[PDB]
Design a protein around this nucleic acid. Structure first.
Lengths: 50, 52, 86, 147, 134, 122, 105
RNA sequence: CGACUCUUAGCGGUGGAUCACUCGGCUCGUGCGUCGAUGAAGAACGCAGCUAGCUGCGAGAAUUAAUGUGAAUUGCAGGUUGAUCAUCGACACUUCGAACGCACUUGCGGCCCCGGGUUCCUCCCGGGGCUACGCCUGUCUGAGCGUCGCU
RNA sequence: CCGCCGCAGGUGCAGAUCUUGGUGGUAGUAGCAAAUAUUCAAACGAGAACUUUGAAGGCCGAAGUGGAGAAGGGUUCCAUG
RNA sequence: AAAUACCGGCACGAGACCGAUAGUCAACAAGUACCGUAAGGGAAAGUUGAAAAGAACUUUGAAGAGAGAGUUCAAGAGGGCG
RNA sequence: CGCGACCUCAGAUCAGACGUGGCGACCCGCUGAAUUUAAGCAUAUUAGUCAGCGGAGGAAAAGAAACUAACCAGGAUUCCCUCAGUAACGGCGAGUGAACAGGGAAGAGCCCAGCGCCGAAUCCCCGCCCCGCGGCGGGGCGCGGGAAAUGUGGCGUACGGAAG
């Protein structure tokens, strides 16, 4: 809710930052294995824990 | 703290501060609105520190 | 009215994040981590879960001290000396 | 994906194999010392008679004698150039050329299990005293030294 | 055979060690033969390959007597790029073509204070082994 | 500029602090240029200045502790930073004096009956 | 269930025996390490006998065996006494000493 | 007649078997046999010019010093008196955690020394060092109509 | 990669409401039906029964389909593409 | 003390073993994603080519997509492609 | 009343140390089932086994006879081979079940209290000096402080010991 702790807000901050797509210059490295970010987490589908 | 910010900007920019107001962003980083006492203009200082 | 109707009233968290294991198994009323037993001095483990032990054993974290120990062993815990200068 | 699949039982994907292989299977077999010497005196006796040796595929139509009992200064040798030159002069070399020509690639999973190449077995040099004969002869592909 | 119990002849192990080698071992892996003039001069068989050597290509499509200067040593790829060995792409611009340093022969060295000490040390330890033999 | 450590290890205690401050200033000037989004030549100098800070700092710390642990050498009690950290159990063991101790019973025994060097004839 | 005439067997395998199977793949490495430690010692105590000290003559007890002779543990004190060796010098010049042995005969 | 359906064959699909490969396992053997209040294992949060994960690391943060080494790193930029690697003995090592001022909000104390308000002189601000339990040897301060002693 | 002579086995499938993956017929089928209701023009556009603007006709009818919170959610907020 | 034990740990060497529905649950960002209030449960997923030489340019279309050219021994190997 | 001695206790952020928690294949001490077998079942069996609790080490535990034997006697402990599916236990049913002797692997032995004699001959710690110790140690120095006769050290232990 609007009412948050410091621990929860740091926690939700890390999950926002982690939920960006991969850069396009990583798909051209010599060990080209990662195609796309398989750890994308949408608010409505998967509920983050807590 | 606001006290440490108000000492820092004064020491780092040769300035004077009316008040400091802080909020912690959803990035997990603080953003501090440092209002200056009327002896100094924000736009006069913005140029010399190098933001425009 | 024991299923889909009664799942509408689920808005009160019993487990929060423990402060040793970080796992969401710190019971709030009891005030005890139902995973690692936090207020207890000793770590909660049992031999009936060989799987649960290998998830949280010594080879699953960083080991920032215990890896320099293994490195530092191989020269008999030398200290104070340096290599010969140029 | 695993939820409600099928875990144990040999037929199932995953599941342990039927009668899982143990490490207390009887690997070794012991033989009577009399039989072991009966077998070695019959392995030596067949080496003498050149119909049996030629039927093994050893190319020895130029060896002057089947026993090829060489001098005792064979054991004093110290170079593979002496060891090949000796086999040239005794005319056993065309057996080593047959082993060279046999040097081929194996067929199957043996290749990824550190047995990549195969070849033929050559002349079996029996010596008395080792004064560099093993060092001289071991680099020739096919020779087995024995005591 | 190899008689040392502390050296491995396992296929997978030697393959992993070759592909996970650090740069200073990839240097040595990527040595090239010296040309016959340079061998009779220096008494050295091979040298680790360097940025500004002049070199002949021996095997593959780009072989011949053409002495090209090296311009990149790609250790992550185990390939080297030479002056005029190139290939035209669709959009007209040219690319360099990675040759393994084994399929290549040094016709001129890039000589320093340090490379000269490697040469001397190699040529010296050569004769010490030679006089143990003869 | 490539600021080495060999040169920093022969300068005065007040000089190195000034050099750290003008480096911190220099970084604080580059990090504004990073956010204005200008000059890619000055996004490459963020690593160079940060490592030049780390070099002049580790030179300060190393000269300070080599000075303290020399002054504290000829003394029984020294702080726990400067005491030897081998493993915990290895600190709990007895000294090379307390090993070499042997009771007056033994000292007389191995005076009277030492172990002889002998050989049997066959 | 028994088929015909055949021996009536009682295999001792009703416990969890598979957990406590002791396999002898150690053996040729156990023999090598013993032979290693043996030669190491034999070189360590350099001119002294490799077997160690001299063991005395001893009759096997129990009528089944008393027609034989073994090596005993160590020389009785009343054998050292009448041989004229001190019990604390004997062990230092390579003579095994047993303080428990009586001399009936 | 044709459509429709059936069978076979050619080519094209759908699907990913077979075959060949293997920086991974499984098993057996050998040498060693080392954590932690001098803060462990484990957690959390952070750190790159462009960086989500993996990996590495700790506000000196994909690494500093040192040694060995000898010209790279490389997806794209950018700029031999030692680039880069490995080694690692010097320095460093945020917040939880046995977890240590008291509580787990990072909330509120105390005790001494510094520096801002000022050129110690009080409240306010910032920095530093102490402030857990149990126990051992000694030390200081005591308690007792416990046992005595002397006026 | 295979023949011959020996050697060893986790050695031969149609079935087990067998395991895992894959595809059929049914089948362009059942269906896309709770709570009154949509319409004319214009704009942007390659493209409009559904967007947006206007005009009309309607519904919720202040115990609301309206304005604000608590718990829960965690960037869903806002702009531009 | 020595001789004995050792599926944990650091390091090695090997195999008549398995060869991606097998062999560890894990050959890959695997104790990962995901599920459960929690204890706990727990996957799938290897291969272009020798070398990206990964298809400039013309042309139809709003575009996905095509048609010609072009590289290669080969696209009857076209980016999840032996 | 008062003042020192002693004993029995408190309190300290007093001086200086030490313990806690982790891992847990192997090792030591406790606690300790039921599946199952007996063609049912209750004693038995599974089994002093799984789960639970504590404590360690590079190994641990054991160990120098209050032993085995009945011999022409053996001589600490541990491990292997055999003794041996044996002597023995058992609704004497199902089942369970060692030891001595013998051959080796290894081999190693010792110390207190007590009894007694040596002027407590003994030990810990502070303060100053010198060498010099990343295992805090040796020397000099002190009418410096304490421990200790409610017994420290030397001699000495069942194989005998001590004095003359």
């Amino acid at each position: 809710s609007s009412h948050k702790t410091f621990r929860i807000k740091r926690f939700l901050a890390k999950k926002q930052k982690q939920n960006r797509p991969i850069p396009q210059w990583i798909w051209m490295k010599t060990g080209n294995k990662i195609r796309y970010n398989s750890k994308r987490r949408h608010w409505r589908r998967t509920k983050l824990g807590l | 703290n606001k006290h440490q910010i108000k000492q820092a900007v004064k020491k780092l920019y040769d300035i004077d501060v009316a008040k400091v107001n802080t909020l912690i962003r959803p990035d997990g980083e603080k953003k501090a609105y440092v209002r200056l006492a009327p002896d100094y203009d924000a736009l006069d200082v913005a140029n010399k520190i190098g933001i425009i | 009215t024991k299923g889909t109707s009664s799942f509408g009233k689920r808005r009160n968290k019993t487990h929060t994040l423990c402060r040793r294991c970080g796992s969401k198994a710190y019971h709030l009323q009891k005030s005890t981590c139902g995973k690692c037993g936090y207020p207890a001095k000793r770590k909660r483990k049992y031999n009936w879960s060989a799987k649960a032990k290998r998830r949280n054993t010594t080879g699953t974290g960083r080991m920032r001290h215990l890896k320099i120990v293994y490195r530092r062993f191989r020269h008999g815990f030398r200290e104070g000396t340096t290599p010969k200068p140029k | 994906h695993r939820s409600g699949q099928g875990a144990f039982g040999n037929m199932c994907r995953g599941g342990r194999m039927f009668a899982p292989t143990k490490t207390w299977r009887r690997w070794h077999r012991r033989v009577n010392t009399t039989q072991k010497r009966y077998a070695i005196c019959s392995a030596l006796a067949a080496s003498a008679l050149p119909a049996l040796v030629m039927s093994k595929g050893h190319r020895i139509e130029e060896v002057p004698e089947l026993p090829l009992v060489v001098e005792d200064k064979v054991e004093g040798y110290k170079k593979t150039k002496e060891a090949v030159l000796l086999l040239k002069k005794l005319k056993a070399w065309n057996d080593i050329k047959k082993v060279y020509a046999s040097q081929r690639m194996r067929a199957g999973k043996g290749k990824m299990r550190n047995r990549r190449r195969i070849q033929r077995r050559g002349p079996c040099v029996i010596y008395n005293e080792d004064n560099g004969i093993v060092k001289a002869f071991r680099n020739i592909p096919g020779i087995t030294l024995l005591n | 055979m190899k008689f040392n119990p502390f050296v491995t002849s396992d296929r997978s192990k030697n393959r992993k060690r070759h592909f996970n080698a650090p740069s200073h071992i990839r240097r040595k892996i990527m040595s090239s033969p010296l040309s016959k003039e340079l061998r009779q001069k220096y008494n050295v068989r091979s040298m680790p390959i360097r940025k500004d050597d002049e070199v002949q290509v021996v095997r593959g499509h780009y072989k011949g007597q053409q002495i090209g200067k090296v311009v990149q040593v790609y250790r992550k790829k185990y390939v080297i790029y030479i002056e005029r060995v190139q290939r035209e792409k669709a959009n007209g611009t040219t690319v360099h073509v990675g040759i393994h340093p084994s399929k290549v022969v040094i016709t001129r060295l890039k000589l320093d204070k340090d490379r000269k000490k490697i040469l001397e040390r190699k040529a010296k330890s050569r004769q010490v082994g030679k006089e143990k033999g003869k | 500029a490539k600021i080495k450590a060999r040169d920093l290890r022969g300068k005065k205690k007040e000089e190195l602090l000034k050099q750290l401050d003008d480096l911190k200033v220099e970084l604080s000037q580059l990090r504004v240029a990073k956010v204005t989004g200008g000059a890619a030549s000055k996004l490459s100098k963020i690593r160079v200045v940060r490592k030049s800070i780390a070099r002049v700092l580790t030179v300060i710390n190393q000269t300070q502790k080599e000075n303290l642990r020399k002054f504290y050498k000829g003394k029984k009690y020294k702080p726990l930073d400067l005491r030897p950290k081998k493993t915990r159990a290895m600190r709990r063991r007895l000294n090379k004096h307390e090993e070499s101790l042997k009771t007056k019973k033994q000292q007389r025994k191995e005076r009277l009956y030492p172990l002889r060097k002998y050989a049997v004839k066959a | 269930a028994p088929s015909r005439n055949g021996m009536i067997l009682k295999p001792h395998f009703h416990k969890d025996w598979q957990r406590r199977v002791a396999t002898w793949f150690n053996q040729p490495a156990r023999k090598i390490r013993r032979r290693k430690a043996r030669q190491a010692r034999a070189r360590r105590i350099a001119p002294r006998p490799a077997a160690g000290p001299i063991r005395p003559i001893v009759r096997c007890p129990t009528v089944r065996y008393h027609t034989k002779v073994r090596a005993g543990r160590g020389f009785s004190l009343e054998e050292l006494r009448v041989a004229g060796i001190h019990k604390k010098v004997a062990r230092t010049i390579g003579i095994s000493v047993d303080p428990r042995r009586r001399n009936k005969s």
